[PDB]
Design a protein around this ligand. Structure first.
Ligand SMILES: *[C@@H]1O[C@H](CO)[C@@H](O[C@@H]2O[C@H](CO)[C@@H](O[C@@H]3O[C@H](CO[C@@H]4O[C@H](CO[C@@H]5O[C@H](CO)[C@@H](O)[C@H](O)[C@@H]5O[C@@H]5O[C@H](CO)[C@@H](O)[C@H](O)[C@@H]5O)[C@@H](O)[C@H](O)[C@@H]4O)[C@@H](O)[C@H](O)[C@@H]3O)[C@H](O)[C@H]2NC(C)=O)[C@H](O)[C@H]1NC(C)=O
Ligand SMILES: *[C@@H]1O[C@H](CO)[C@@H](O[C@@H]2O[C@H](CO)[C@@H](O[C@@H]3O[C@H](CO)[C@@H](O)[C@H](O)[C@@H]3O)[C@H](O)[C@H]2NC(C)=O)[C@H](O)[C@H]1NC(C)=O
Ligand SMILES: *[C@@H]1O[C@H](CO)[C@@H](O)[C@H](O)[C@H]1NC(C)=O
Ligand SMILES: *[C@@H]1O[C@H](CO)[C@@H](O)[C@H](O)[C@H]1NC(C)=O
Ligand SMILES: *[C@@H]1O[C@H](CO)[C@@H](O)[C@H](O)[C@H]1NC(C)=O
Ligand SMILES: *[C@@H]1O[C@H](CO)[C@@H](O)[C@H](O)[C@H]1NC(C)=O
Ligand SMILES: *[C@@H]1O[C@H](CO)[C@@H](O)[C@H](O)[C@H]1NC(C)=O
Ligand SMILES: *[C@H]1O[C@H](CO)[C@@H](O)[C@H](O)[C@@H]1O
Ligand SMILES: [Cu+2]
Ligand SMILES: [Cu+2]
Ligand SMILES: [Cu+2]
Ligand SMILES: [Cu+2]
Ligand SMILES: [Cu+2]
Length: 525
């Protein structure tokens, strides 16, 4: 097994790996400002889940929150034959009730960098995410793996406090950003007792001449980054969970939920350097956007702020150029049927996004998968179901008709897709399909729907189940910018063990909902 192994077809034998995670109500001080958080195991980021390609994960998730369901998603994890462990509440399970435990089981049939996060409403915005790193092949050599660097915005209160405001349609400017869970913040004016100060920059220490694999993930609520390290080059070796033909870049545009693995050679004059998130100010607002930075040190004892000169950011909300993103294991898209769908917006009780006029709104007590187990094939209109059955491919064209010009990071569950087109133009059903790239196009699981343009993503019908596709901007998802593919419904294979477990989760959730303190007040996802 190697970098040229087809991991969609072949999977190594591995070992069983077991984790207990507690979804917790916490207090943290990541940037010198003390606030509530919703965490795995009291840390933001959550604990590292590290495994090998082909391992079986067993992850016992206990919900120790008092006032929310929860449901944990393993982002970009294919979940072939483990649909009920995808962690989408209202799609592949009922929410895990307070006090209850759901044990997620799945094999990792991919390798690279990803993460896990709650998919229950906005929870991941309060810190409910962690790294999921799967060891395997890599398209370039390096001597050291520094692991993951999370890039995010960071509020100074619960995302749930500001939801009622945000749902009037404008995402609010958050108070700060974190790089790998930390940042500075100026508390030396504040009369807020929580602003205790002492927040510190993310530090990364290089040994000169050593090669470092960095694993970048944008995990913000509503944030775009263009990661750069002053006077260093990034050699990009993977996008999401798909190794790519290495290419070098001064900066790396990164949408929410996207990952890149980069190799950085520490071949610069030994000094302190700015590490730049390069918050996309055009993409979304932040109170402290220029402070989305950290410190590269070649000398650990140095406590000096770097004074390096950075590269000029492209300053866009785009993804990396399609031409740059060439998977190592080349794969082409076969004959396809085309599904076309259109993003617009409406206002009801609040601001919603629509997919062909319907905003996603799930009933947590009746997930698509329960409906499937009950042999339903017609789904509520607000479940935004697109049915798929075998031409073994689908091109899904999603069009921004909102007029907003936001670059939406579109995430597909159950599949890597193929970026056959990512265009800043109006989609024409008679002209545009011709301009698709079907021959080893970029392949990944988050890609930008360009603002005012279209994203055309192809996938194979190789994974029966009900698969959410959504904007990964947390507000947008909560605002129903989502649909779901019900793929070969009659081919979905579920174990009696897993059906029993699913039913129990739903039973406990149904036992919880009559005295819940808080109702569902978003899409559910
Ligand atoms: C950004 O910030 C994050 C922190 O949020 C930071 O994360 C760090 O990532 C590093 C690189 O990826 C990482 O370094 C690695 O750590 C690995 C593992 O850490 C260990 O855990 C080991 C294994 O767990 C155990 O299994 C053994 C048997 O082998 C048992 O003895 C042990 O009891 C435990 O038990 C079992 O767990 C299994 C599943 O794991 C189950 O199957 C079993 O049933 C049982 O429950 C252990 O061997 C180690 O001692 C250690 O605890 C290393 O393997 C790897 O080689 C590498 O060194 C680091 O740990 C992360 N740190 C934190 C705090 O999360 C990033 O580095 C930050 N990024 C940057 C750029 O700074
Ligand atoms: C999940 O749990 C959290 C508790 O952490 C619940 O958050 C709460 O959500 C409600 C309803 O949105 C909030 O009420 C609103 O507060 C704002 C801001 O002060 C106000 O403008 C509104 O008029 C409204 O009253 C409440 O503040 C918020 N609480 C906290 C501590 O954040 C959330 O509703 C739970 N969701 C589910 C589905 O269980
Ligand atoms: C997380 O917390 C739970 C509950 O305390 C504990 O059982 C579990 O072992 C912890 N897991 C890790 C990875 O720290
Ligand atoms: C977390 O704790 C806060 C403060 O005690 C509480 O008001 C809130 O309801 C809790 N959140 C959840 C999801 O249980
Ligand atoms: C980052 O924040 C600190 C604290 O306010 C400030 O001194 C510094 O100027 C900031 N950098 C900017 C605004 O570019
Ligand atoms: C969505 O709407 C457009 C325009 O009416 C139409 O071409 C397309 O087929 C619709 N898609 C679905 C899946 O209903
Ligand atoms: C769903 O269909 C299968 C196969 O016909 C059947 O065995 C099962 O009992 C059905 N569930 C229902 C009708 O609720
Ligand atoms: C990735 O590669 C493409 C194609 O060579 C470039 O256009 C891009 O700027 C980046 O280097
Ligand atoms: Cu309470
Ligand atoms: Cu995700
Ligand atoms: Cu996902
Ligand atoms: Cu969006
Ligand atoms: Cu998702």
């Amino acid at each position: 097994y190697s970098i040229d192994t087809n991991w969609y077809d072949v999977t190594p034998t591995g070992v069983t790996r077991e984790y207990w995670l507690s979804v917790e109500n916490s207090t943290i001080t990541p940037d010198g400002y003390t606030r509530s958080a919703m965490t795995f195991n009291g840390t933001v980021p959550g604990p590292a889940i590290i495994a090998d390609w082909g391992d079986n994960l067993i992850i016992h998730v206990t919900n120790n929150l008092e006032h929310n369901g929860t449901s944990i998603h393993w982002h970009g994890i294919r979940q072939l034959g483990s649909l009920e462990y995808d962690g989408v509440p209202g799609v592949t399970q009922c929410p895990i009730a307070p006090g209850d435990t759901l044990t997620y089981k799945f094999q990792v049939t991919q390798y690279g960098t990803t993460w896990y996060h709650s998919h229950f409403s906005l929870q991941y915005g309060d810190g409910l995410f962690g790294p999921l790193i799967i060891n395997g092949p890599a398209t370039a050599d390096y001597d050291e793996d520094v692991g993951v660097i999370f890039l995010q915005d960071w509020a100074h209160e619960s995302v749930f406090e500001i939801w009622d405001t945000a749902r009037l349609g404008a995402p609010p400017a958050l108070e700060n950003t974190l790089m790998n869970g930390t940042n500075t913040f100026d508390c030396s004016a504040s009369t807020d007792p929580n602003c205790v100060g002492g927040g510190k920059k993310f530090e990364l220490t290089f040994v000169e001449g050593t090669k470092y694999r960095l694993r970048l993930i944008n995990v913000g609520i509503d944030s775009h980054f263009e990661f750069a390290i002053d006077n260093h080059t990034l050699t990009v070796i993977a996008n999401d969970l798909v190794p790519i033909v290495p290419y070098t870049t001064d900066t790396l545009l990164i949408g929410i939920g996207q990952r890149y693995d980069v190799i950085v050679e520490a071949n610069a004059a030994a000094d302190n350097y700015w590490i730049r998130g390069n918050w996309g100010t055009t993409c979304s607002t932040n109170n402290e956007a220029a402070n989305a930075t950290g410190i590269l040190r070649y000398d650990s004892s140095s406590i000096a702020n770097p004074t390096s000169v950075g590269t000029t950011p492209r300053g866009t909300c785009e993804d990396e150029p399609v031409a740059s993103l060439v998977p190592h294991l080349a794969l082409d898209v076969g004959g396809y049927s085309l599904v076309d769908e259109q993003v617009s917006s409406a206002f009801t009780n609040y601001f919603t996004w629509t997919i062909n006029s319907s905003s996603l709104l799930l009933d947590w007590s009746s997930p698509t998968t329960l409906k499937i187990f009950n042999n339903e094939t017609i789904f509520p209109t607000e479940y935004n179901v697109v049915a798929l059955e075998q031409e073994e491919w689908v091109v899904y064209v999603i069009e921004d008709l909102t007029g907003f010009g936001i670059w939406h990071p579109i995430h597909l569950h159950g599949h890597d897709f193929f970026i056959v087109a990512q265009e800043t133009d109006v989609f024409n059903s008679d002209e545009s399909p011709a301009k698709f790239n079907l021959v080893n196009p970029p392949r990944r699981d988050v890609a930008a729907l360009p603002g005012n343009g279209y994203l055309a993503i192809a996938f194979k019908l190789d994974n029966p189940g009900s698969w959410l596709l959504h904007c990964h901007i947390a507000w947008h998802a909560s605002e129903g910018l989502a649909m779901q593919f019900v793929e070969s419904q009659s081919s979905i294979a579920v174990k009696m063990t897993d059906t029993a477990i699913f039913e129990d989760t739903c039973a406990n959730w149904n036992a919880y909902t009559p005295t819940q303190l808080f109702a569902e007040d978003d899409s559910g996802i």
